[PDB]
Amino acid sequence: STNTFNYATYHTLDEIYDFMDLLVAEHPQLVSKLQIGRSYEGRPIYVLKFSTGGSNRPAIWIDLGIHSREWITQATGVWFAKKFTEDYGQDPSFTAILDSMDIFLEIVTNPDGFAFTHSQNRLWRKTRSVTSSSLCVGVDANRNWDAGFGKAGASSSPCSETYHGKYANSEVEVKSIVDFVKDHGNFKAFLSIHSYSQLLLYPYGYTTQSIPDKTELNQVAKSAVAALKSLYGTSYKYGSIITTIYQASGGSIDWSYNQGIKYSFTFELRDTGRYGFLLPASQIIPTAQETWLGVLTIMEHTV
Numbered sequence: 001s002t003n004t005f006n007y008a009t010y011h012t013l014d015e016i017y018d019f020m021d022l023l024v025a026e027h028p029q030l031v032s033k034l035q036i037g038r039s040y041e042g043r044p045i046y047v048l049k050f051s052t053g054g055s056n057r058p059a060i061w062i063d064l065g066i067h068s069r070e071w072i073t074q075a076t077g078v079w080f081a082k083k084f085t086e087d088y089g090q091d092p093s094f095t096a097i098l099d100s101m102d103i104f105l106e107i108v109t110n111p112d113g114f115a116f117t118h119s120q121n122r123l124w125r126k127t128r129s130v131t132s133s134s135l136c137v138g139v140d141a142n143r144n145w146d147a148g149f150g151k152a153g154a155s156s157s158p159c160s161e162t163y164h165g166k167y168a169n170s171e172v173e174v175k176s177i178v179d180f181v182k183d184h185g186n187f188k189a190f191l192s193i194h195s196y197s198q199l200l201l202y203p204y205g206y207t208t209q210s211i212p213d214k215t216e217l218n219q220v221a222k223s224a225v226a227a228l229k230s231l232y233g234t235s236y237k238y239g240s241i242i243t244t245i246y247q248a249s250g251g252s253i254d255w256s257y258n259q260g261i262k263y264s265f266t267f268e269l270r271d272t273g274r275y276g277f278l279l280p281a282s283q284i285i286p287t288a289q290e291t292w293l294g295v296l297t298i299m300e301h302t303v
C-alpha cells in the first residue's frame, strides 16, 4: 500500500506506476489516474488528478522527470502525491486550495528515458525517439516546446544532449501535455520540476526581454524560496531562466506563459553539484519536504 511504500529510496518505473494505482484505490474520492498519451516506445503516460469536485475547476499543472536522469524529481513527485492525500482536510491552507482548484501531477514525464536510466544509462536525459538518418536517439523534451523553438539555447545536432527535434511538439511526451492543457483551458499555474542547482526560475529562457508580469512573478518566486529555506536553511537563487541558469530555447514554461498561464515556474532541486544527479536517497525526504513549502506558496498566490 502507499502506507508500506518506502518514500526514502529511489524506485523503478513499475514501482511508481504501482504506487499510483495504490493511491487511487485508497483515495477514490480525491485521486484519479488519467492516461494522456503513450510514450515513443509505447508506455502509458499517466497524470494524477487531485480534485474535490466541480467541473473544469481552475487548475495547477505540475510535471516532474521530463529529464529522466533527474531522479530526485520523480521521487519528490511520489512524496507530493501522498502528501496531498494526507493534508486535505487537515492543513487549513492546502484544504482551501483543493476546495477551489484541481491539481494535475505528472510524476514521470519521460517514461522511456526513466526506464533507460535503470536498464542501461543512469545519466540519460532525452526521450528515446528514433532519429532518421542518425546513429543517435532522443530529443531534449525541454527544448521541444513552441517558444523560441530552434533558436540559440538548443541544438540541431541529433547526437546533442539539447537536440530540439525536427519541429516544435515533435515528441509525443510534449504534445500529450500541450493537448491536455489546451483542451482543459483553465490552468492557472504550470510548474515544471527539474534538478539540479537550487534555483526557482520564471520566463524567459529564449530572450533577454523581461516578461510583463516580472514584478509579480519575481515576488512570488522570492516568497516561495523563502518558504523553502525556512525548513532546513537550503539556499536557492531565483530569476528568469536566461539570467539565472543559461539561455535555453523551446522550454516549457516559456510556452505556458505565452499561452496565458501567468504562474509559470521551473524548479531546480538539490544540490548545487556536490552529488549532482546522483543525489543520495537519504536526501529525498528533506528535499521533498522543503520543496513542498515552495510549491504550496506558489499555489497560495494562484488561489
Ligand SMILES: *C[C@@H](S)[C@@H](Cc1ccccc1)C(=O)O
Binding pocket: 067, 142, 194, 195, 196, 201, 205, 241, 245, 248, 249, 251, 252, 253, 266, 268
Ligand atoms: C535543469 C535544467 S536541465 C533545465 C533549465 C531550464 C531550461 C529552460 C527552461 C526552464 C529550465 C534545462 O536545461 O532544461
Ligand SMILES: [Zn+2]
Binding pocket: 067, 070, 142, 194, 195
Ligand atoms: Zn532538466
